[PDB]
Design a protein around this ligand. Sequence first.
Ligand SMILES: *[C@@H]1O[C@H](CO)[C@@H](O[C@@H]2O[C@H](CO)[C@@H](O[C@@H]3O[C@H](CO[C@H]4O[C@H](CO)[C@@H](O)[C@H](O)[C@@H]4O)[C@@H](O)[C@H](O[C@H]4O[C@H](CO)[C@@H](O)[C@H](O)[C@@H]4O[C@@H]4O[C@H](CO)[C@@H](O[C@@H]5O[C@H](CO)[C@H](O)[C@H](O)[C@H]5O)[C@H](O)[C@H]4NC(C)=O)[C@@H]3O)[C@H](O)[C@H]2NC(C)=O)[C@H](O)[C@H]1NC(C)=O
Lengths: 298, 165, 159
Amino acid sequence: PAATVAVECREDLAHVEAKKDLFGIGQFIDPADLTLGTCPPSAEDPAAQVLIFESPLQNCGSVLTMTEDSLVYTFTLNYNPKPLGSAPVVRTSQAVVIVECHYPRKHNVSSLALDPLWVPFSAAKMAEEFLYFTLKLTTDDFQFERPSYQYFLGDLIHIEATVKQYFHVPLRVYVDRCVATLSPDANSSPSYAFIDNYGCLLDGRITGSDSKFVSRPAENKLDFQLEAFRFQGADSGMIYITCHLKATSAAYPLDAEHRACSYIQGWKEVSGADPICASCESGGFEVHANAVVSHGTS
Amino acid sequence: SPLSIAELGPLNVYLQIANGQCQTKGCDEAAAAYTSFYTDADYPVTKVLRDPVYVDVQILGRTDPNLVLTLGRCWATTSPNAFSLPQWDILIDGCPYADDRYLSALVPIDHSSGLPFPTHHSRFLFKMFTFVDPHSMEPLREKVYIHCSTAACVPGQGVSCEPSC
Amino acid sequence: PKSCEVPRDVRVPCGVPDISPSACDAIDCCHDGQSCYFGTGATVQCTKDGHFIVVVAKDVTLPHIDLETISLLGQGQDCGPADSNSAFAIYYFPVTYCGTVVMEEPGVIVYENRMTSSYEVGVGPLGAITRDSSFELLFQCRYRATSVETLVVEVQPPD
Ligand SMILES: *[C@@H]1O[C@H](CO)[C@@H](O[C@@H]2O[C@H](CO)[C@@H](O[C@@H]3O[C@H](CO[C@H]4O[C@H](CO)[C@@H](O)[C@H](O)[C@@H]4O)[C@@H](O)[C@H](O[C@H]4O[C@H](CO)[C@@H](O)[C@H](O)[C@@H]4O[C@@H]4O[C@H](CO)[C@@H](O[C@@H]5O[C@H](CO)[C@H](O)[C@H](O)[C@H]5O)[C@H](O)[C@H]4NC(C)=O)[C@@H]3O)[C@H](O)[C@H]2NC(C)=O)[C@H](O)[C@H]1NC(C)=O
């Protein structure tokens, strides 16, 4: 056999074609004498003189082998001649042909595109609350709240304004206005703004008093004293005091609108930053002056 | 002495992503997934991070049950080219990559799967991710592709056709 | 969008018992007629003593956000989640702590802080990956800082 045995190797199946004149001797063989393993031929090609085997690769006496590159299915096409009829005689020689089908063993595979998904989060929020203050009459040492609200003329009314700090950044408290009235209405007449113009304690300036901002025991506290008084036409004794209180951080710069000033032989700033108070000497207030006459000897 | 004829023949391997949906709440999700597989039209396929991606690798058109498909390295890329970088490892030497917290897993494909040739298939799952620029540690916002090296294997030889892990 | 469709096993109550429905609304919470609880989303509350209160639903991101990945603008022992259930995380720290930025505005003291979540990255020889989302929240407290305070005195001539 030289060009006798041909093969086509498919995925599931091997297709073997043998020339009927297997030996190229001019005389065809018995298709019953040619067996692929133990399998007989499947069909005949009376025009191509081809005996056609078809076997799935695991059948018909197939041996499966592994190599680096390939899988090998090795078959054996065996020609075992049998007697030519009642005669115990054979006119051909026995033979076997080895048929191999190689198959690529190793492969790499890929998927189509996957698209990852996630939901990110991005937002802004605001929230609000109030800083809480206390305005309370206190004692001569601005240490304890005064048990009673009654004073005589010529006493000093000690008052402390405080912003409660809790867990806040160091706060500073400011008192920028206070209006005294007979009726609880802060706009009622008569009225007297003993503190005004962003912290100017104008009482000591207009009345010639010792009313002043004593000191700040802490930044969130401001102590001041106001020498008592009455209104000209007042029959009642009770006087209502209404103040505006502000607060910032201790790191906020002292300003012309952030100050506590008092006139002590010149406008003076508690904390000692006296120049800040220059603008307390505005218009709108008229310093008191007692009258004058010429010298006489008693 | 004898004659010997030899020729080549095709042998193909195919990878697909499962899209099976759990029958009812409570079912075995891993089993329910491989009851269906995405087609080409379905891609690109959106899947959220950390979600299980079920994968099936398969030899096509064979009928010899002795063949065993064995997986080698299964990895991921940002582009279709599997040799392209960056890369993440899902399987190495046929066993889940060990330096991943969201560990990958191999899915046993026993008779419960009920396949005509369960040996021809090899299944595995990984947890969905997205590639990141390591320098900025920020999402690359790029697609992902899944790749596997495979080998058809024959038991009874000197070689082993299953991964010890 | 924030919704109040929160089931009763994971609701976080808002810290004012027997609060009224409109007050519970003021604190940015939810009221069902019988109780007041935090809604669905990120909630910011500033309280009278100067403490931040933040409630964040773990479902604000997909996949859900972890509690370790989130970090505030400054580090500290108080900057971690104060409390947590299966669905919400609760943060409670002073406005002074955790790198809070303080700003000044006319009549209001503004505190600012920022939550950021960092991807946990798996690094290999040839790649870097993440399976996390991102979560960024910028929240502020605007404490209004002015009031009208009053007192009374009685002045009598000496007698
Ligand atoms: C199916 O899928 C499989 C899995 O993906 C594929 O296999 C992969 O194929 C790729 C590409 O060939 C391989 O990459 C190479 O791997 C080697 C060795 O890697 C080891 O470590 C990894 C760890 O993950 C293991 O997985 C692996 O099994 C090995 O154990 C690397 O060395 C390679 O790096 C070099 O080549 C790449 C390009 O391929 C270059 O980009 C890189 O810079 C490296 O260049 C070399 O650099 C050295 C110096 O460091 C040079 O050495 C110097 O040379 C000069 C001149 O000669 C002089 O002597 C100096 O003295 C000397 O130092 C050297 O010349 C450079 N070589 C180059 C440029 O070629 C590369 O990473 C994967 O490893 C491989 N994976 C597996 C599991 O096998 C398979 O191919 C797929 N099949 C199909 C058909 O698609």
